[PDB]
Amino acid sequence: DEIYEDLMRTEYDKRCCCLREIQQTEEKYTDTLGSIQQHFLKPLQRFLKPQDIEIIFINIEDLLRVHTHFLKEMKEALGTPGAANLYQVFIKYKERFLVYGRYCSQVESASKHLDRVAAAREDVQMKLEECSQRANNGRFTLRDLLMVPMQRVLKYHLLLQELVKHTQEAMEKENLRLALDAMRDLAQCVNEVKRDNETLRQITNFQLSIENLDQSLAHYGRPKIDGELKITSVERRSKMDRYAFLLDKALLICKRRGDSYDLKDFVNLHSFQVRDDSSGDRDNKKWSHMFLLIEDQGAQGYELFFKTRELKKKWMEQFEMAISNIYPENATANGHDFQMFSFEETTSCKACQMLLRGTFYQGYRCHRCRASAHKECLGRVPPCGR
Ligand SMILES: Cc1ccc(-c2cnc3c(N[C@H](CO)Cc4cccnc4)nccn23)cc1
Ligand SMILES: [Zn+2]
Ligand SMILES: [Zn+2]
Numbered sequence: 001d002e003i004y005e006d007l008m009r010t011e012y013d014k015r016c017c018c019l020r021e022i023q024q025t026e027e028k029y030t031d032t033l034g035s036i037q038q039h040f041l042k043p044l045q046r047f048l049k050p051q052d053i054e055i056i057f058i059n060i061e062d063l064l065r066v067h068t069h070f071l072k073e074m075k076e077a078l079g080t081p082g083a084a085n086l087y088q089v090f091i092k093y094k095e096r097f098l099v100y101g102r103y104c105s106q107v108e109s110a111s112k113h114l115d116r117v118a119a120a121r122e123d124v125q126m127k128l129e130e131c132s133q134r135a136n137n138g139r140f141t142l143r144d145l146l147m148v149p150m151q152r153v154l155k156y157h158l159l160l161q162e163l164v165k166h167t168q169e170a171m172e173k174e175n176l177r178l179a180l181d182a183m184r185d186l187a188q189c190v191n192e193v194k195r196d197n198e199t200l201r202q203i204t205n206f207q208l209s210i211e212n213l214d215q216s217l218a219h220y221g222r223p224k225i226d227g228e229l230k231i232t233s234v235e236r237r238s239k240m241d242r243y244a245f246l247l248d249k250a251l252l253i254c255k256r257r258g259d260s261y262d263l264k265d266f267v268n269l270h271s272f273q274v275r276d277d278s279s280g281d282r283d284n285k286k287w288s289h290m291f292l293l294i295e296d297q298g299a300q301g302y303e304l305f306f307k308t309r310e311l312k313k314k315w316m317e318q319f320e321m322a323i324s325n326i327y328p329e330n331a332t333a334n335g336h337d338f339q340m341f342s343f344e345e346t347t348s349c350k351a352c353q354m355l356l357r358g359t360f361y362q363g364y365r366c367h368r369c370r371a372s373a374h375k376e377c378l379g380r381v382p383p384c385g386r
Helices: 002-007 011-044 050-057 060-079 086-120 122-136 148-153 156-165 170-209 309-326
Strands: 223-232 240-247 250-257 260-268 272-276 289-295 301-306 338-341 363-366
Touching: 002 148, 011 050, 011 060, 011 122, 011 148, 011 156, 050 086, 060 086, 086 122, 086 148, 086 170, 148 170, 156 170, 170 223, 223 309, 240 260, 240 309, 272 309, 289 309, 301 309, 309 338
Parallel strands: none
Antiparallel strands: 223 240, 223 301, 240 250, 250 260, 272 289, 289 301, 338 363
């Protein structure tokens, strides 16, 4: 991005040059956090209402407080001849940079609110231009500066990557790779928050469209796939034209009515299994591509028909992915009973002790002992009722 680019401006040169670059951009970034606080946050408190400040700036002050201490510890480690303790700074501050979670989640809606407050008031609109002049001579608006903290967290792993490449001492190279991994994890934490928020928006849209559904879709996990299909059942053997929404825990069978969809059948995937039918084959005919969805006690069996082989293939992989998410490998290992969970507060995995990243269905919780864990960590968790 152009705004970040403009704001941030021998074999062992490269190694030493990278250290200067890291320290320079960190000072430049901490001053930018200071600029938002002094030139925008304190003067706008006299204009905007307290709730508007809370929404637009979020925890910006706490970010500045964390980076003030980070730049101080960075300077001491880089200062000492050798800079061998630099890796320890990045490892310690990865856990301190958790404060970014709240920021990353709320920043898009803070930008939207800032636009609304400025559009409604020429008074605020003129004060926003005034602040930009006193801080950066109008080169950067508050709108662009509030997006800078997010651009910055995604740069740390690109900075340490270059430093690792140009480090020749095998022990310092190995220690810096631990700091590089920890920074690569921080960049993944951002993606999980953006990705989960987009899922939460998609769910909201589906609630609007689906009629006669008297339940929140958030209870069924993540949307998998949605689309037209033909359906058959044991008691009604003729193909019914339908629209289906597949989420991790449920399949909704609806009837399309322009934009609106009327719920006809609710299928709870905890009790159902997928069975392939290769009979409709070699893409012979439209609507001949079928698989079965059978209830685990033989109570019901649905035949699902799709227009093409490509479509049927895609739906089958998504049903497999959904049932694997309800019932993952080692879900009942060591006395536990791990089930899909959406965590409100910041939580760590009982097995690897790492964060359950994101804002929606981040992992699993055993209902018995209440231990939290990642999908791939279930078998490693301590036995239920230690
Ligand atoms: C740079 C960066 C660092 C960390 C994050 C980040 C990613 N996921 C979380 C998290 N998740 C919890 C569930 O454990 C729910 C939750 C989510 C968001 C806010 N508050 C609570 N807690 C703290 C931070 N988190 C994102 C970006
Ligand atoms: Zn884990
Ligand atoms: Zn348990």
